Design a protein around this nucleic acid. Sequence first.
RNA 1: AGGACGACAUUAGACGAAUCAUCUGGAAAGAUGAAUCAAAGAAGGUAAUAAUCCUGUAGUCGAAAAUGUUGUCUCUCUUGAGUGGAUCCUGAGUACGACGGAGCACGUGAAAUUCCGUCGGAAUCUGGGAGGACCAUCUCCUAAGGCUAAAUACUCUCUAGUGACCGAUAGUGAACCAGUACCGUGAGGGAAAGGUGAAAAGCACCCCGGAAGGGGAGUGAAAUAGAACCUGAAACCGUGUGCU
RNA 2: AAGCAGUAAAUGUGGAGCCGUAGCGAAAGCGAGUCUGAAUAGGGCGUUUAGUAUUUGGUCGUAGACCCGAAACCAGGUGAU
RNA 3: GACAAUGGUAGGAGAGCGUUCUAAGGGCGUUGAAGCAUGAUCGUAAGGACAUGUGGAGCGCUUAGAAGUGAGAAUGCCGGUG
Lengths: 64, 192, 144, 59
Amino acid sequence: PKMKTHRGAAKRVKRTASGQLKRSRAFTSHLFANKSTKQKRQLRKARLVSKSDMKRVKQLLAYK
Amino acid sequence: SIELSDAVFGIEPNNSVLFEAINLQRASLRQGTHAVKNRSAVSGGGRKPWKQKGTGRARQGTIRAPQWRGGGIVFGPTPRSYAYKMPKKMRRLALRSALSFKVQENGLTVVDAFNFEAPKTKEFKNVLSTLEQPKKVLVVTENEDVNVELSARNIPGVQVTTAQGLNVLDITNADSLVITEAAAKKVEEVLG
Amino acid sequence: KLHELKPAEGSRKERNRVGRGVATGNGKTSGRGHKGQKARSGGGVRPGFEGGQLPLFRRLPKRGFTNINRKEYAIVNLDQLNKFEDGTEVTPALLVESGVVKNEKSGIKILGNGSLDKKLTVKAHKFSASAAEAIDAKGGAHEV
Amino acid sequence: GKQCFVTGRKASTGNRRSHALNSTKRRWNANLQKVRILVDGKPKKVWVSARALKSGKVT
RNA sequence: AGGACGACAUUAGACGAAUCAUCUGGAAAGAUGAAUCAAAGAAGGUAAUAAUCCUGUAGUCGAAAAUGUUGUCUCUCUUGAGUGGAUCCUGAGUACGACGGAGCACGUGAAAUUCCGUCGGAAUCUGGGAGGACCAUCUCCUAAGGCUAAAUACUCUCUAGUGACCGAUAGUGAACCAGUACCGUGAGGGAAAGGUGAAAAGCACCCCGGAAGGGGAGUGAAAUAGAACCUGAAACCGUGUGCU
RNA sequence: AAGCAGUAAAUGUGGAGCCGUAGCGAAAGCGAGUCUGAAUAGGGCGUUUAGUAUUUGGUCGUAGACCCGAAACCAGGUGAU
RNA sequence: GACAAUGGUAGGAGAGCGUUCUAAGGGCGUUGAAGCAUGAUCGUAAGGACAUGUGGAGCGCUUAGAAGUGAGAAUGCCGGUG
């Protein structure tokens, strides 16, 4: 049958033109009195997944 | 006389597409009706026969296991289809390459209208002898001709067909082409 | 000649057969290494998550939504408009039959990457603000 | 088993759930009552649900 | 909703072209020469390998009687639309709501549409429902009565036919008189067993022996082809011997 | 692609569609630029545009999935000779 | 023609031998097919021939195609025999 995509990965990433994935940042949910005002302001920018995780999880997003 | 066109008969043949067209037409004639029983489908089993530990014998679970004599084929045949496909331009180019090979080999031979009013194989055998054709021949026409296929269908090596029924395998298998002056322009208008 | 056939060079290869001899180097263990979970008929672990520490798409936060009325447009840059003779009032019908647009999704949008260098009368659904200037500085109009 | 005479009411089957959604099979019976209704041939006593006994019957 | 009205199909069948001679051979279909048919060069048998020896194939012909399907003729059936609007009708313990469940891709969630058990319970064309909580305006429709062919799924079974399917440890468990010897109180489980030769021509008769079994002599092209029958291998068991 | 035709042939017709020609952004939406922000100021991703159909080989996913093997668990029956 | 290089498990890459079947071409066979027995033959290996005996009718070669494709070991299954 058709291969099934990961429905919880498809809510956390998006494909860039080169085929890289644009993820989001962890540690931004609560407990903000403990993080610096600079470490809170730089966790607000999205980044790309690594080469290693792309090695691991790249069949789960073969339709994305 | 002579009726041809350099864009359906002057094609430089394409061996790499001709091989795939022949192999495709060969793979598409296979039935594929071959099956075999496995552990699920062999009658019997469902009872361990030796009680596992406490007996000097090797531990077993079924009398229909792939090792026991009498049951269980591991990965045998199964009924599957064998045909595949390829682009339309490649199909057309394969036919053009086959016909150009018959032309370059000096196989093609155009003739005027076949005229048979009653079926008879003596007449067709004599017509081939007059034209001095090889034992394997392909008689092509514009439509179905009920007195050219009733004759020349019990002769060994003579195959009769139509302009809208040309294979790559039946052309590459013959030795000579005997087309008419209608089927020639018909095939030049279909292809090319 | 059916008794003399050759595939194009580099077109076919031998498959590889494990479990048949030690000269092949895949006969015993079949390239699967020694005892482990990855050496058992059956297999290894589910792809991505392994049962071990926390997977990657269970450790990053979700994001965004999907708009139900998202409208997408079939894009047509200016340079694709050069295949049309002068005049030749261009519509989404001529633009699909000509052979530049296939799937008129929600309409067509003329974008302005390239050089027009013609005098057309483009009729589209939406224009870019850098394509209207190009289509009207070579002479020409555009109705929406 | 039993079932309403006039209409067709009869027990149905479903689940019964805990506060943790632990399912367990259970039944839902009809509110059948032994009522002596008046059909000719003889007045006979039969099962009738209390839903049909309201607003129209013979007894 | 009951009957009367000639063509096809099934269930037996008939006709059906064209080859002779020599060598090897136990035997010709093989090799060597010449020759014929073909709407027939599919296939099987025949003392070996056959388009022309047999059964057949292409083609054409056939049906007392039973059945199926089908065309026409009867046999039935059977008043179809357009205006007008006072007023009357238009499926009720139904629709729907609360509580407890289920079903919708949809896990009670903001959950629409749909069913069930218990309680409550509408309106009547200005009516009633839907357009994913809910309200208003717009658009589409008219529940609570029922029937229905085709496209679709499958094969115990009959009729033709096919296979880069097996070839007796394989293919059905079963090519054999197998679901049987048997084995179990029972439900139930389950094997293993193919082949003389072209034709039984299957050894008249003589000799040793109580018989079994031989040794001849005959049948045969072959008897280490003699029914413990094609071939006959390895482990294993022997008899003789060359060097040690 | 299914469908139609035809020797279960192989070969025509069919262009609903599907991939690519343009991205970026949660989205409205702008367009080779866009998003953030007061602001190209800088930065992130782009302008890298040659792809596409079929097919041999390697590997992965869904199916028992390289082969043999439990102690058991559920359902329906058979047993007090 | 000069120079160098060539141990190897797990495993990675390449080139090959052989088996059953299919297509097309070209062959062999009762003047004796395959199989099976022997031999003091050929190839770098997998393996290929030839001669003799037997046997008793089928079988190779070339080029491609497709796989139930090659077994000393699983207290492996079945048969035979120590």
